[PDB]
């Protein structure tokens, strides 16, 4: 009953060209068991392409690694990102109807990351709630964690959530 491997993988950009499979692993093994750890290299020169990826045994380990940012690896600050299924900090939240308030969205989404803006949409002409909102976080990993979830339940409502611009 292991989580799908794609959800346990981190792309690591901005590597020092000195970083190896071995030094990448020794760094990121501090936050979990690594089943995979690869630095991308030119197939002819063997010179690093400056990025790679690691795969943890569990999603909780990915979370731990992401929560331990910033990561300085072989003297350079790198850029870890979760693997695809587009880096933004804002989400569209739809299906919240007219009874959902800012505290409902806050209490739920603050457990994904630090919120900077909550905007509940209202009709330009009437002021009535239109049934959707935008939430802006201080960091993209919150959004990445949010949009891979199959379901979101806020204030009893089943919500549609998607990345916003």
Curated annotation (Swiss-Prot):
Top-level lineage group: Eukaryota
Region described as Globular B domain: 86-165
Sites of the Glycyl lysine isopeptide (Lys-Gly) (interchain with G-Cter in SUMO) crosslink: 97
Subcellular localization, as worded in the UniProt entry: Nucleus; Cytoplasm
Residue numbers spanned by region Globular A domain: 1-85
Modified residues annotated as Phosphoserine in this record: 16
Domain RRM: from-to ranges: 8-85, 89-165
Glycyl lysine isopeptide (Lys-Gly) (interchain with G-Cter in SUMO2) crosslink residues: 2, 72, 163
Processing and modification events after translation: Sumoylated.
Reported disease: Inclusion body myopathy with early-onset Paget disease with or without frontotemporal dementia 3: An autosomal dominant disease characterized by disabling muscle weakness clinically resembling to limb girdle muscular dystrophy, osteolytic bone lesions consistent with Paget disease, and premature frontotemporal dementia. Clinical features show incomplete penetrance. Amyotrophic lateral sclerosis 20: A neurodegenerative disorder affecting upper motor neurons in the brain and lower motor neurons in the brain stem and spinal cord, resulting in fatal paralysis. Sensory abnormalities are absent. The pathologic hallmarks of the disease include pallor of the corticospinal tract due to loss of motor neurons, presence of ubiquitin-positive inclusions within surviving motor neurons, and deposition of pathologic aggregates. The etiology of amyotrophic lateral sclerosis is likely to be multifactorial, involving both genetic and environmental factors.
Subunit structure, interactors included: Identified in the spliceosome C complex. Identified in a IGF2BP1-dependent mRNP granule complex containing untranslated mRNAs. Interacts with SEPT6. Interacts with C9orf72. Interacts with KHDRBS1. Interacts with UBQLN2. Interacts with PPIA/CYPA. Interacts (via the RGG-box) with the HOXB-AS3 peptide; the interaction inhibits binding of HNRNPA1 to the intronic sequences flanking exon 9 of the PKM gene, preventing inclusion of exon 9 and promoting inclusion of exon 10 which suppresses formation of the PKM M2 isoform and promotes production of the M1 isoform.
Function (record text): Involved in the packaging of pre-mRNA into hnRNP particles, transport of poly(A) mRNA from the nucleus to the cytoplasm and modulation of splice site selection. Plays a role in the splicing of pyruvate kinase PKM by binding repressively to sequences flanking PKM exon 9, inhibiting exon 9 inclusion and resulting in exon 10 inclusion and production of the PKM M2 isoform. Binds to the IRES and thereby inhibits the translation of the apoptosis protease activating factor APAF1. May bind to specific miRNA hairpins.
Record protein name field: Heterogeneous nuclear ribonucleoprotein A1
Protein species of origin: Homo sapiens (Human)
